[PDB]
Each structure stands twice: as C-alpha cells, then as structure tokens.
Amino acid sequence: GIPTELKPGTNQFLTTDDGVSAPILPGFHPTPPIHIPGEVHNLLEICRVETILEVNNLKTNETTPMQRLCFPVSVQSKTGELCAAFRADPGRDGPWQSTILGQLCRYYTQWSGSLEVTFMFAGSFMATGKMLIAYTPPGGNVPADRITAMLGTHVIWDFGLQSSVTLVVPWISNTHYRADYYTTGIITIWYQTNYVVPIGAPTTAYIVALAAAQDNFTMKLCKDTEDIE
Amino acid sequence: GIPTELKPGTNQFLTTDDGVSAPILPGFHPTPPIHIPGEVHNLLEICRVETILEVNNLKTNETTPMQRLCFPVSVQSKTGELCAAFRADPGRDGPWQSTILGQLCRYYTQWSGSLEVTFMFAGSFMATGKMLIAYTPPGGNVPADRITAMLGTHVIWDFGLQSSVTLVVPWISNTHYRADYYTTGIITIWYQTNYVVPIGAPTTAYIVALAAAQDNFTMKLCKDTEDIE
Amino acid sequence: GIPTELKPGTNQFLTTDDGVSAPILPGFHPTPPIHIPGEVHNLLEICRVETILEVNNLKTNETTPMQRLCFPVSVQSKTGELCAAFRADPGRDGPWQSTILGQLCRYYTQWSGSLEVTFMFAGSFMATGKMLIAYTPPGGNVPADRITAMLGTHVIWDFGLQSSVTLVVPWISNTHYRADYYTTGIITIWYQTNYVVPIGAPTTAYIVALAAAQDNFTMKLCKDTEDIE
Amino acid sequence: GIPTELKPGTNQFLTTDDGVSAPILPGFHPTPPIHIPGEVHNLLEICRVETILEVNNLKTNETTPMQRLCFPVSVQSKTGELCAAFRADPGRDGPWQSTILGQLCRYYTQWSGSLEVTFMFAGSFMATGKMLIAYTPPGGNVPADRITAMLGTHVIWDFGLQSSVTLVVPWISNTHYRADYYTTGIITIWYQTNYVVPIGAPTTAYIVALAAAQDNFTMKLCKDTEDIE
Amino acid sequence: GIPTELKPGTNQFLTTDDGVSAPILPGFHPTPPIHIPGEVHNLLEICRVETILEVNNLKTNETTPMQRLCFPVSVQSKTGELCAAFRADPGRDGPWQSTILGQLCRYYTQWSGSLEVTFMFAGSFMATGKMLIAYTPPGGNVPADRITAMLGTHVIWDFGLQSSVTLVVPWISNTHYRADYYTTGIITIWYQTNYVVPIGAPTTAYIVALAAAQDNFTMKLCKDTEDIE
Structure with a gap:
C-alpha cells in the first residue's frame, strides 16, 4: 500500500470544516428547481432597502408603538428650535433597531460604508415651511442653535416644494469600547421657519424617516444576534 | 509518507454507501453470459403493460375470486343507471391492487403520469348497446345521473361496433395525508342504452378491465412494501 | 494533510488479497535465472499428455499392482463377447485415478472438453484379430451385445494391421449430485473376431490404455485435493 | 478504497513539522495589508547597522551607565601609552553586548564574516593629535608597546584631520570550548601623539565607538537567548 | 474524504524499510561539502588492493607477530623440498585473515571471482635461485613432490631475474558446510634449485606475500562480522 x-x-x-460527506440516499434525484422571482444572493441587497426609522422612540410610546414610526411638526414650534435628533448608529440601540439594516448589523461584528436617510412630509398639501437638516461629523459638538448647525454640513428643506428629501451620511465605522468615549455623527432637525398653514388645514403634521445603506456598505465576521431569547 | x-x-x-470491496476469489472467471430474450432494464417497462383490474371486488366475491376479474351488464338494467364506479388510485387499496402497476407503486413513495384503462366486452356477438364511460377530474363531484356525466369528459361506447375501448386518465399525482380530504379522479360506467339481444343469446355478459401507465409515468423514492408479512 | x-x-x-508487502531485504539482488528446458506455464500442458489408465483395476490386483496397467485378450474368448468396459470420468474414482489428468482434476471443481483414449496391442507380431471399441453417449444404455454396440459410435480395430488405435470422447462435463442418477459416456471393448495366432506364439496378449485431454479441455475453481492425508 | x-x-x-491545518474561520477575509515603510525581511539587515559599543564598561560605571557609551583621551596621557583595548567577540560578554549585533548573535549558534568598527572624536574643534588603532589577528600576542603595534595591522588616525575613522575586522568565526584557550583578534587604541589643544579648550574629550557586521556576515542554527529571565 | x-x-x-521521516530541523542548512581526495564508493575498490598475507602464521610466532608477515628460504633447504603451502580461502581462518580482503569477506555471506597473489623476494642482490609456485585446483590432491607440482598449473620463479612474481587464482566460490569435505585450491611453494649466494651475503632471506581480489570479484548478502566482541 501507499x-x-x-x-x-x-x-x-x-x-467550520467544509468537507464532503457520504450521500445518505445515492439513488434519489431531488425535485428539480423552477423559477421563483426575488431570489436573494447577498444580504447587502436587503440593506440597500429603505426601512422605517423609529426616530420617535419615546418611553410614552411603548403602549401605542404605531406612533414611533413618525414624529411631528406643528405651529406652536418657534422658528429656530430643535425638532428632533438622533445619531447614525445602525448596530447600536435606538431608532435604528426598527430598520432592516440595524437588525442585520447585529448579525455581524464589523461594518463600514455610507448611509442615506430619507425624510417624507405627510401634512396637508396646503402647508409650507422650511426645516433645516444637519449632520454633525463624528467627534463633533452637537449644534447648539440653528445658526451653528447651518455652518456645518446641512440641508434647507422646504416641504412646500419637495415632499421628500434625502441626506447622505458620508461614512461610518464601528468600534466596541466599554466598561463612554465613542460617538458617531449626529443628525439634527431644526425649524428654519415655523409651520405655515391656511384656515381649514391641520396644524400638526408628521415626518416619516426611512434609511438604508449605500453600495459601499459592507460587513464582516458573523456572530449570532442577541435580539432573540 | 503522505x-x-x-x-x-x-x-x-x-x-447505502457504494464502495469497492476486495474480490473474495481473484482467480475465478465467472461463467460468461449468453442471450436470454426479455431482459428488463427499468421497472416502468413493466408498468406500461396492461393487467387486469379487479373492479368487481365485492365482499361476496372473496370465496370465488375468479369473479372479481370482470363485472357484468344485463337486460334488467334500465337505460341511464350507473353500472360501476371506481377511482384511478394505483397505489391505494381497491381494484388497482390486482394490477402489476399498483403492486409496483407500493414499492415507491411518489409517482405521477397518465394512465390508460381499457374495457373489453365478452358477450355474444349478437348483442349490441351503448355504455357511457366518464372521467370525473380530481376534486370534482361524482356524476349524479347519466346526463351530468355526459357534460364532463366522457366516451359513448357502442359495443355493437367496438368490442374494446380505451380511456385515458390525463394526470395523476399522489399525496399522503391522514389521521379524509383527498380524492383523485373517478371513472363511472353508465348504461346509455339497455342491453339489446335477440332470441337465443345470453342476457348477461361481462366486461373486463385492463389498465397500465403511459410513457410519462414515473416514480421516485424506494420503500419496501407492506404487501407481504 | 489529505x-x-x-x-x-x-x-x-x-x-486471497493480492497486495504488495515491504521487501524484507532491500539491498539483496537475488541470483539471476538461467535457461532450464521444460518450463511449464499452464497445467493443461500436462493434461494433454497421455498417461496409463488402470482399466484392469481388480480387487485381486491390489497385491500385484503392476497388472492393473494392462488388461488381456486370449483365445478362450468367443467372438462377440465383452472384453472390458469403463466410463470416461476423469475426476471420479476408478481407472482414471492413475492418469495425470484425473489427479489434476481433483485439484479443481469444474471441467469440460474432449478426451482421447489410445489403445496399444503388445502381443506377438504373429497375432491378428479384430476388437470393436464403442462409445456410448451420456445418458445412454450400455450396449447389450456386440451387434447393438456396432450401431452406435464405434471403431473396428484390427490389431493385425494397426498396433495402436485412438478413440475420441467428444465431450464431457461434470456435475456433483448425491446423498445415483448421473452417468457420463461408456467405452466398451468387444471381441469382433477371436484371437488368432499360429503355432509357437503366446495365446494371451495384453492391451495398454493411455488417455489425455484434448486442447478444448479446461478447468476452473481450485480446491485442495482429498488424495493425500 | 485505496x-x-x-x-x-x-x-x-x-x-518543527510544517504542515497545513484547517482554517478555524473559513468565511473570514482578513483585513488587507497596506504599505508601511521599513519592512524587514532578514535579520542581517539589522546587523549591518552601526550601534554603540560600550568600550568603557567599567565596574565603576554601572551606577552612571551613560558613561559607558564613550571613553576618553586627555592631556595627561603620554605619547605612546595604551588608551583602550577590547576584542572583536560579538556573541560573548563585554562591550559588544550593547550593540544590536551582539544581541542578535545570542539568538544563534554559529556565525562568521567581517565586522567594521567606527571611531568618532567629539572634542573641541581646536584639538588635534594622532591615535594609533591596531588589530592583532586571532592567536596573536597583544601589542606590548606602541612600536610593536605599529608593525602589525594598524591605522594612524589624526583627529585633527578626520573626525571619524573606520577599521575593518577582516574575519571572525566562533567556537565554543570550555570547562580558556580561545582568543579572537584584539583592537588596541594607542596615543601616537599627546592630546594638543590651545588655551580656552577642554583638556579632556571623548571617543564614541560604533560597530556593525559587513555584508559577508551570516549566522546559522537558532537558539533562544539567555539575555532575559 | 478519499x-x-x-x-x-x-x-x-x-x-530495513527505507522511508522518509520528518526533518527535525527544517530551517537548518547543513554545512556544504568540499573536495576531499580519496572518496570511496564501493568496498570492492578496497578489495583490489594488495595487503600482506600472514603465510608464516606459526603458533611460535604469536609473541613476535612481526615475523608472520614474511617466511624464509635458506641454504640448508635441499632442491625440491616444499617451502610453504596455504590455500586460497579469503573468508576462512588462516593467512588470509591479515589481508583487507579476508576481513571484508567476513562482512558478507557469499562471494566469487579471481584473486592474485604476489610474491616479493627481499634477500641480498647477490642471491639467485629458482622457486616453483604451484596452484592445485579445488578438489585436487596437493602435490606430493616437486615433479608432480610441475605437471599442474605452475610458475618457475627465478628471483635472480625478477624480484617479484604474481600468480592468479582463476576462480573461487565459497559454500558453508559443517557439523569436513570442502576444499578450495592450494598454493604450494617449492625449491626448484637451492639458495645460491657468494661469500659475504646472508644465507637466509625472506619472501613477502601480498594478495588482492581481481575485478571480477564480487560479494552479496551482508552480515555483521564475528571478528570483534
């Protein structure tokens, strides 16, 4: 012999060894496949899909969760006041947990790329006004007033002209540190002008936030999630 | 070494592993083969052969089994009355158990294809009349009267003209469900006209039923039968 | 690794596995071979060689075995009487055991082919007469008289003309059955004429029988013999 | 099977077997490399770098080690007297232990090649004088006076002209023997002339000694050092 | 897997298996070889070298072994008398044990080939005379007198003309038999003439015997010797 x-x-x-085992049923010819639309090849295909961000994730919402899907704007708000704010942390807890992206991020250890957040205005066709969207780069001081936010990366959104607007988070990474000191970029929504509306129209409308990863987004090192029990 | x-x-x-074992007798040269007609290569060759259906499988027959091989028609029967009925269930119990096809189906788990049932009339050459053969598709209501059966897939068979006629079950599948709700197609034989005969001829004749699988019939997943003990 | x-x-x-083992002495160069005439390659070479049949295997011979090597003819014998008889059963017990063929047949399980038996006459050059040799095919009734033997496969041998004659057993097979019913072909030697001799010559001479397998003879399935202890 | x-x-x-093991994480794609200047491929690259010799390794220095990095010359010294002396034994204990070369030699069992020792003079630009450097070949008697040293391989170094001079140890080997009798080549520094200096300049200056292996230097047979504990 | x-x-x-083992030190590069004259490739190279035969191996010599290296001739010896005798048995005990050939033969089991024995005369240049060398083939009667030896393979050696002469043993084999009956060829040295010498020269001189295997000599089957303890 040899x-x-x-x-x-x-x-x-x-x-994790990838070998070849003996076929339990050698004579069996498995039913052949047919065409089923929507075959997925890579999870990133799913991550490029906009899902709803629960920006309005208040402790008072928990019993009426349907309200977390959108936050509001109103006439009472004064020009220049802060409307909402959250950071761009897909993997971590918070608004991003509701998105398909943030849920899949938990299934991995590292990730990086660009993200795009879309804002949709639902109020009466008769309403108009301007909101200021601002991205504060990682390791930056969250804007204190409307005027400072304006000096940084921002977007003046006139929902009287566009019912929707999209912002792009240029780049994210993620590093675990702990037992803080970390801080990723911060989106801040400001009232540039107050909410203007005529007689006969609701004085309180809602904004819906959707987000997704761009093409350059990628992840590595799998790890079962902690989302279930 | 390696x-x-x-x-x-x-x-x-x-x-079920298919390996190679050491030849117990390496010097032995097995007697060479010769030609024997009738070599079989695939069981389906056997399934395409018409065998006799025991359509007349009555509890009162058991002691004189030779009578199950054929059912009868007679003068007493009135025009339009139901003669016989059975379904096209090769694998399951019933008339099909007598056929070579149904016996081989038990040796497998799944199967599908077309079937063809042939009816042969044995009565006196002097007899004439018409029988109506009808196939009621799977998940269909068994014909109530001759007239409804006629509206479905049917064949008016005049045994005064043809001593034999063949019907084709377009398609069968089989799904185990149980402990009903399943139902495959149903062949129904009706008296279109009564049995006509002159003086001197038997007033009771017999029909023989033969059946076989067509070419598109195929089976998969072997399993030892339950037909023996 | 792999x-x-x-x-x-x-x-x-x-x-019976035919493998390769490690050479106990790798540096050793075995003495080279030279030419030795008479190398044998197949046992059948030996089976094609005529050896002496002990046709005269009487219980009264055992103490003077040299007499089994040949049987005799004499003047006392009357025309038409049976001289000797034995069957063509190489493997089985009997006369064939003395031959090299029958001894090698015991070393195998199956065999088949033609055989040739040669008869040699040793008596005085002055003697003459005719003997009738007859082969009775397998499953045939041994000849009763000279006349019937003559109607079957036979050879009129005039030892006044030929001192030797050869007979050919067309075909033999062997099947074990037992604990008869089997019977292979039967050679019978008859006196066609009586033994004729002049004054001065011995009135009793001997015949020697030699036999061998022809070319079409072959054997299969080895098995150690029962000839030794 | 095989x-x-x-x-x-x-x-x-x-x-020390060099095999292939199963990748613990087959799906993982390690972070790709980038360019980092200063990649090292062979330890000899490091050995060709001049490092400081602790020629002035006195027992009285131990508490002010910074003084071992250089020895001195002065006016008090008379023409012809011995300044310093040490041998060219990279691996062994002594001045060479401070060099990167001698430290790496301990990580090996055998070595051989040429070495080059450089001497740098740090005193006032106004000082002048001549030092005599001499290499006494292996198995040679260390020079007794300046005059004998001059008859052997030597270099008259005038630090009034060159602030630095380099000597080349032609060849070294190393053989362990012990429990001496071994002796490798010996560098001796002599005062050819006394230290000359004008008014206003320090009357004591220092020499720094650097050494490195040349290109032909090579080592074999690894062995963990004894330099740590 | 496979x-x-x-x-x-x-x-x-x-x-005696000749396999491949894992290199204990894979990174080590063994010191490279240089040229050393006198490399030996096969032991037969050594066997072709003449070594001294201890023909004069007397029991009385043992305490002054230097005398075994040569035997003598003298004036007292009469024409025709036997001088010395020994057989050509390299492997066996006796004179051949002193030779390099006989020592190496013990390291093997079989051998065969030709041998050549050289005789050298050391006496005074003034001496003359003739010696008769004779080889008695294996299985032959040792010569009884000078005259019979002369009739067999012989050489008349006149040491007044040639100071040396070489004899060739045509062929030897070796077969162990024992617990004789074996006998290989026998060299016999005879006095053809007496030792002649003038006044002033020693009346006793010595002959030195050297022997070696020729080219056709070969050996097979190794076996550790019994020469040591």
Whole structure:
C-alpha cells in the first residue's frame, strides 16, 4: 500500500470544516428547481432597502408603538428650535433597531460604508415651511442653535416644494469600547421657519424617516444576534 | 509518507454507501453470459403493460375470486343507471391492487403520469348497446345521473361496433395525508342504452378491465412494501 | 494533510488479497535465472499428455499392482463377447485415478472438453484379430451385445494391421449430485473376431490404455485435493 | 478504497513539522495589508547597522551607565601609552553586548564574516593629535608597546584631520570550548601623539565607538537567548 | 474524504524499510561539502588492493607477530623440498585473515571471482635461485613432490631475474558446510634449485606475500562480522 502518516488534527470534528460527506440516499434525484422571482444572493441587497426609522422612540410610546414610526411638526414650534435628533448608529440601540439594516448589523461584528436617510412630509398639501437638516461629523459638538448647525454640513428643506428629501451620511465605522468615549455623527432637525398653514388645514403634521445603506456598505465576521431569547 | 488527516465518517458503515470491496476469489472467471430474450432494464417497462383490474371486488366475491376479474351488464338494467364506479388510485387499496402497476407503486413513495384503462366486452356477438364511460377530474363531484356525466369528459361506447375501448386518465399525482380530504379522479360506467339481444343469446355478459401507465409515468423514492408479512 | 475516510474492510487480512508487502531485504539482488528446458506455464500442458489408465483395476490386483496397467485378450474368448468396459470420468474414482489428468482434476471443481483414449496391442507380431471399441453417449444404455454396440459410435480395430488405435470422447462435463442418477459416456471393448495366432506364439496378449485431454479441455475453481492425508 | 499502510511517525506532533491545518474561520477575509515603510525581511539587515559599543564598561560605571557609551583621551596621557583595548567577540560578554549585533548573535549558534568598527572624536574643534588603532589577528600576542603595534595591522588616525575613522575586522568565526584557550583578534587604541589643544579648550574629550557586521556576515542554527529571565 | 483501506503491515516498523521521516530541523542548512581526495564508493575498490598475507602464521610466532608477515628460504633447504603451502580461502581462518580482503569477506555471506597473489623476494642482490609456485585446483590432491607440482598449473620463479612474481587464482566460490569435505585450491611453494649466494651475503632471506581480489570479484548478502566482541 501507499505509505501515509496521520498528522495532528486527525479524527477531529471542526464545526467550520467544509468537507464532503457520504450521500445518505445515492439513488434519489431531488425535485428539480423552477423559477421563483426575488431570489436573494447577498444580504447587502436587503440593506440597500429603505426601512422605517423609529426616530420617535419615546418611553410614552411603548403602549401605542404605531406612533414611533413618525414624529411631528406643528405651529406652536418657534422658528429656530430643535425638532428632533438622533445619531447614525445602525448596530447600536435606538431608532435604528426598527430598520432592516440595524437588525442585520447585529448579525455581524464589523461594518463600514455610507448611509442615506430619507425624510417624507405627510401634512396637508396646503402647508409650507422650511426645516433645516444637519449632520454633525463624528467627534463633533452637537449644534447648539440653528445658526451653528447651518455652518456645518446641512440641508434647507422646504416641504412646500419637495415632499421628500434625502441626506447622505458620508461614512461610518464601528468600534466596541466599554466598561463612554465613542460617538458617531449626529443628525439634527431644526425649524428654519415655523409651520405655515391656511384656515381649514391641520396644524400638526408628521415626518416619516426611512434609511438604508449605500453600495459601499459592507460587513464582516458573523456572530449570532442577541435580539432573540 | 503522505500527510493525511482522518475526517469524520471514518470507520462507518453506511448501508447505502457504494464502495469497492476486495474480490473474495481473484482467480475465478465467472461463467460468461449468453442471450436470454426479455431482459428488463427499468421497472416502468413493466408498468406500461396492461393487467387486469379487479373492479368487481365485492365482499361476496372473496370465496370465488375468479369473479372479481370482470363485472357484468344485463337486460334488467334500465337505460341511464350507473353500472360501476371506481377511482384511478394505483397505489391505494381497491381494484388497482390486482394490477402489476399498483403492486409496483407500493414499492415507491411518489409517482405521477397518465394512465390508460381499457374495457373489453365478452358477450355474444349478437348483442349490441351503448355504455357511457366518464372521467370525473380530481376534486370534482361524482356524476349524479347519466346526463351530468355526459357534460364532463366522457366516451359513448357502442359495443355493437367496438368490442374494446380505451380511456385515458390525463394526470395523476399522489399525496399522503391522514389521521379524509383527498380524492383523485373517478371513472363511472353508465348504461346509455339497455342491453339489446335477440332470441337465443345470453342476457348477461361481462366486461373486463385492463389498465397500465403511459410513457410519462414515473416514480421516485424506494420503500419496501407492506404487501407481504 | 489529505482528508481521508477509512472504509469498511480496513485492517482486514484476506488470504486471497493480492497486495504488495515491504521487501524484507532491500539491498539483496537475488541470483539471476538461467535457461532450464521444460518450463511449464499452464497445467493443461500436462493434461494433454497421455498417461496409463488402470482399466484392469481388480480387487485381486491390489497385491500385484503392476497388472492393473494392462488388461488381456486370449483365445478362450468367443467372438462377440465383452472384453472390458469403463466410463470416461476423469475426476471420479476408478481407472482414471492413475492418469495425470484425473489427479489434476481433483485439484479443481469444474471441467469440460474432449478426451482421447489410445489403445496399444503388445502381443506377438504373429497375432491378428479384430476388437470393436464403442462409445456410448451420456445418458445412454450400455450396449447389450456386440451387434447393438456396432450401431452406435464405434471403431473396428484390427490389431493385425494397426498396433495402436485412438478413440475420441467428444465431450464431457461434470456435475456433483448425491446423498445415483448421473452417468457420463461408456467405452466398451468387444471381441469382433477371436484371437488368432499360429503355432509357437503366446495365446494371451495384453492391451495398454493411455488417455489425455484434448486442447478444448479446461478447468476452473481450485480446491485442495482429498488424495493425500 | 485505496490500499494504504500507516508508517512509523503516524500520530506524532513534531514542534518543527510544517504542515497545513484547517482554517478555524473559513468565511473570514482578513483585513488587507497596506504599505508601511521599513519592512524587514532578514535579520542581517539589522546587523549591518552601526550601534554603540560600550568600550568603557567599567565596574565603576554601572551606577552612571551613560558613561559607558564613550571613553576618553586627555592631556595627561603620554605619547605612546595604551588608551583602550577590547576584542572583536560579538556573541560573548563585554562591550559588544550593547550593540544590536551582539544581541542578535545570542539568538544563534554559529556565525562568521567581517565586522567594521567606527571611531568618532567629539572634542573641541581646536584639538588635534594622532591615535594609533591596531588589530592583532586571532592567536596573536597583544601589542606590548606602541612600536610593536605599529608593525602589525594598524591605522594612524589624526583627529585633527578626520573626525571619524573606520577599521575593518577582516574575519571572525566562533567556537565554543570550555570547562580558556580561545582568543579572537584584539583592537588596541594607542596615543601616537599627546592630546594638543590651545588655551580656552577642554583638556579632556571623548571617543564614541560604533560597530556593525559587513555584508559577508551570516549566522546559522537558532537558539533562544539567555539575555532575559 | 478519499476512501482508503488500511492493509496488513500498517503500523509496523521494519528495520530495513527505507522511508522518509520528518526533518527535525527544517530551517537548518547543513554545512556544504568540499573536495576531499580519496572518496570511496564501493568496498570492492578496497578489495583490489594488495595487503600482506600472514603465510608464516606459526603458533611460535604469536609473541613476535612481526615475523608472520614474511617466511624464509635458506641454504640448508635441499632442491625440491616444499617451502610453504596455504590455500586460497579469503573468508576462512588462516593467512588470509591479515589481508583487507579476508576481513571484508567476513562482512558478507557469499562471494566469487579471481584473486592474485604476489610474491616479493627481499634477500641480498647477490642471491639467485629458482622457486616453483604451484596452484592445485579445488578438489585436487596437493602435490606430493616437486615433479608432480610441475605437471599442474605452475610458475618457475627465478628471483635472480625478477624480484617479484604474481600468480592468479582463476576462480573461487565459497559454500558453508559443517557439523569436513570442502576444499578450495592450494598454493604450494617449492625449491626448484637451492639458495645460491657468494661469500659475504646472508644465507637466509625472506619472501613477502601480498594478495588482492581481481575485478571480477564480487560479494552479496551482508552480515555483521564475528571478528570483534
């Protein structure tokens, strides 16, 4: 016979070894496949899909969760006051947990790329006004007033002209540190002008926030989530 | 020597593994083969052969089984009355158990294709009349009267003209469900006209039913039968 | 290393396995061969050689075995009487055991082919007469008289003309059955004429029988003999 | 299966065997590399770098080690007297231990090649004088006076002209013997002239010694050092 | 993995198996070789070298062994008398044990070829005379007198003309038999003429015997000797 020498690692079962096992049923011809639309090949295909951000994730909402899907604007708000704010942390807890992206991020250890957040205005066709959207880069001081936010990366959104507007988070990474000191970029929504509306129209309307990863987004190192029990 | 690593599955005996064993008698030259007509290569060759259906499988027959091989028609029967009925269930119990097809179906788990049932009339050459053969598609209501059966897939058979006629079950599948709700297609034989005969001829004749699978018939997943003990 | 899986049959020693073992003395160069006439390659070469049949295997011979090598003819014998008889059963007990062929047949399980038996006459050059040799095919009734033997396959041998004559058993097979019913072909030697001799010559002479397998003879399935102890 | 025979050495783990093991994480794509200047490929690249010799390794220095990095010359010294002396023994204890070369030599068993020692003069730009550097070949008597040293391989160094001078140890080997009798080449620094200086300049200056292996230097047979604990 | 089957001989260590083992030090580059004159490739190179035969191996010599290296001739010896005698048995005990050939023969089991024995005369340049050398073939009667030896293979050696002469043993083999009956060829040295010498020259001189195997000499089957303890 052929002189062989068993080397270390013989007889071991590695749950990640990718070998070939004996077919239990050699004579069986599995039912052949047909065409089913919507086949997915890579999870990133799913991450590029906009899902709803629960920006309005208040403790008082928990019992009427349907209200977390959108936040509001109103006439009472004065020009220049802060409307809402949240950071762009897909993996971490918070608004992003509701998105398909943030849920899949938990299934991985590292990730990086651009993100795009879309804002949709639902109020009466008769309403008009301007909101100021601002992205404060990582390791930056959250804007104090409307005027400072304006000096940074921002977008004046006139919902009297566009019912929707999209912002792009240029770049994110994620590093675990703990037992803080970390801080990723911060989106802040400001009232540039107050909410203007004629007689006969609701004086309180809602904004819906959707988000998704762009093409350059990628992830590595799998790890089962902690989202279930 | 050659560095090898034994992988999981070493030393196991799989009754379905298809390996090569050492020839017990290496010097032996087995007697060479000759030509024997009728070599069979695939069981389906056998399934395409018409065998006799025991349509007349009555509890009162059991002691004189030879009578199950054929059912009868007579003068007493009135025009339009139901003569016989059975479904096209090769694998299941019933008339099909007598056929070579139904016996081989038990040796498998799944099957599908077309079937063809042939009816032969044995009565006196002097007899004439018309029988109506009808196939009621799967999940269909068995014909109530001759007239409704006529509206479905049917064949007016005049045994005064043709001593034999063949019907084709377009398509069958089989799904186990149980402990009903399943129902495959139903062949129904009706008296279109009464049995006509002159003086001197038997007033009771018999029909013989033969059946076989067509070419598109196929089976998969072997399993030892329950027909023996 | 190379992923391998030990299959059933590992570690077994099959006395008929034909493998390769490690040379006990790798540096040794065995004495080279020279030419020795008479090299044998196949046992059948030996079977084609005529050896002496002990046709005269009487219980009264055992103490003077040299007499089994030949039987006799004499003047006392009357025209038409049976001289000797034996069957063509190489493997079985009897006259054939003395031949090299019958001895080698015991070393095998099956065999078939033609055989040739030669008869040699040793008496005085002055003697003359005719003997009738007859082969009675397998499953045939042994000749009752000279006349019937003559109607079957036979040879009129005039030892006044030929000192030797050869007969050919067309075909033999062998089937074990037992604990008869089997019977292979039967050679019968008859006196066609009486033994004629002048004054001065011995009135009793001997015939020697030699036999061998022809070219079409072959054997299969080895098995140690029962000839030794 | 394939007939194999396990040979001696099966199941052994040799700490120096260079095999291939199963990748613990087959789906992982390690972060790709980028360019980092200063990649090292062979330790000899480091050995060709001049490092400081602690020629002034006195027992009285130990508490002010910074003084071992350089030895001195002064006016008090008379023409012809010995300034310093040490041998060219990279691996062994002594001045060479401070060099990167001598430290790496301990990580090996054998070595051989040329070495180059550089001497740098740090005193006032106004000082002048001549030092005599001499290499006494292996198995040679260390020079007794300046005059004999001059007859051997030497270099008259005028630090009034050159602030630095380099000497080349032609060849070294190393052989362990012990429990001496071994002796490698000996560098001796002599005062050819006394230290000359004008009014206003320090009357004591220092020499710094740097050394490195040349290109032909090579080492073999690794062995963990004894420099740590 | 690859289906393999361990065959008999697995896990065995055969001291003569010629396999490949793992290099204990894979990174080590052994010191390279240089040219050393006198490399030997085959032991037969050594066997072709003449070494001194201890023909004069007397029991009385043992305490002054230097005398075994040569035997003598003298004036007292009468014309025709036997001078010395020994056989050509390299492997066996006796004179041949002193030769390099006989010592190496013990390291083997079989051998065969030609041998050549050289005789050298050391006496005074003034001496003359003739010696008769005779080889008595294996299985031959040792010569009784000078005259019979002369009739066989012989050489008349006149040491007044040639100071040396060489004899060739045409062929030897060796067969162990024992617990004689064996006998290989016998060299016999005779005095053809007496030793002649003038006044002033020694009346006793010595002959030195050297022997070696020729080119056709070869050996097979190694076996450790019995020459040491």
